[PDB]
């Protein structure tokens, strides 16, 4: 009673199951080695970066190479509880990544920079 409408035979859609492993392959998940402390190495005391602070209301940091603009923005929020308007990154010709994190206008750059230790 069932006819073959098409002249081409196609492989039937067979049922396939998912993974029910009897044991995990690795014993434990790997700990995050790209946490909020390994992503922020140290800021800059450069007078070129110093001038950017009170003028552009920003902050300058050396950031780990495997970072991301979403993680760098979340990192400075986690450490020094300051909100970020935008985060701006570049890779220096020495191997590492530099970030120009822009603050919101409601906070002051040089006020929080004294809490960092740089002046």
């Amino acid at each position: 009673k069932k006819i073959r409408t098409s002249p081409t035979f196609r492989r039937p859609k067979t049922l396939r199951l998912r993974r029910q492993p009897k044991y995990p392959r690795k014993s434990a998940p790997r700990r995050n080695k790209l946490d909020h402390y390994a992503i922020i190495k140290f800021p800059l005391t450069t007078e070129s970066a110093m001038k950017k602070i009170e003028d552009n209301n920003t902050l300058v940091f050396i950031v780990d190479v495997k970072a991301n603009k979403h993680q760098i923005k979340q990192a400075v929020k986690k450490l020094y509880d300051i909100d970020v308007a935008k985060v701006n990154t570049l890779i220096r010709p020495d191997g590492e990544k530099k970030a120009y994190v822009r603050l919101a206008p409601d906070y002051d750059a040089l006020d929080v920079a004294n809490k960092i230790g740089i002046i």
Binding site: I3, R4, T5, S6, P7, T8, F9
Partner: protein, 241 residues
């Protein structure tokens, strides 16, 4: 009333160049896979080539209604089942010292399933009836057994399928089934089936062993030859006769 004149027919014309073709059955023209196409024409090669009578003998299979009584009589003699060996072993386990018995009395007769078991007890004339499956995909396992049972005087029958012959034993396939011993009240029931099988396989053995099979062409080719025969008949049947 009930009818409404807004229901016209507007039929579809399925002609050449007319309205489009419907979704009819196309089973003849499906591009089948390699494994389907191989096995379908493999049975055709079993009808094209001149199959030898030692292999063609398995095309003459026991008929339908006699196969029921062969299986009905074998149903009460089937080999015993897993966990019933343990039911049999445990039942005789207490009897050692429970009711003063060593259990030496009797083992009930059962069938035989392997080709090596059957052939040993056919050479020694311990067989009374041999059942042979025809669809063994190496045919070389059972070719001499139809020929060997004739000389030893053991009746042999050919049955459809190793599946239902593999259902008497508790397995998948079973090529051979041989009756060694039966009970006294089933001896008369086995005897009425022995003579019916001998007159079909053993007694007319000279007919089977020189009976070639095959040489059957395709219906597309046979009808072309039959068209030539009737055209030759149409040309010269009324001119003289």
């Amino acid at each position: 009333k009930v009818v409404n004149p807004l229901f016209e027919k507007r039929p579809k014309n399925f002609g050449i160049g007319q309205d489009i073709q419907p979704k009819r059955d196309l089973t003849r023209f499906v591009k089948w896979p390699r494994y389907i196409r191989l096995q379908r024409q493999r049975a055709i090669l079993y009808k094209r080539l001149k199959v030898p009578p030692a292999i063609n003998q398995f095309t003459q299979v026991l008929d339908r209604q006699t196969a029921t009584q062969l299986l009905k009589l074998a149903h009460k003699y089937r080999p015993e089942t897993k966990q019933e060996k343990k039911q049999r072993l445990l039942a005789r386990a207490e009897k050692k010292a429970a009711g003063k018995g060593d259990v030496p009395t009797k083992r009930p007769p059962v069938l035989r399933a392997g080709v090596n078991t059957v052939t040993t007890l056919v050479e020694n004339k311990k067989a009374q009836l041999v059942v042979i499956a025809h669809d063994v995909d190496p045919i070389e396992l059972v070719v001499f057994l139809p020929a060997l049972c004739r000389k030893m005087g053991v009746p042999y029958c050919i049955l459809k399928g190793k599946a239902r012959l593999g259902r008497l034993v508790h397995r998948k396939t079973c090529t051979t089934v041989a009756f060694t011993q039966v009970n006294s009240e089933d001896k008369g029931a086995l005897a009425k089936l022995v003579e019916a099988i001998r007159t079909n396989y053993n007694d007319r053995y000279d007919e089977i062993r020189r009976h070639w099979g095959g040489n059957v062409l395709g219906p597309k080719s046979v009808a072309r030859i039959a068209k030539l025969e009737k055209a030759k008949a149409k040309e010269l049947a009324t001119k003289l006769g």
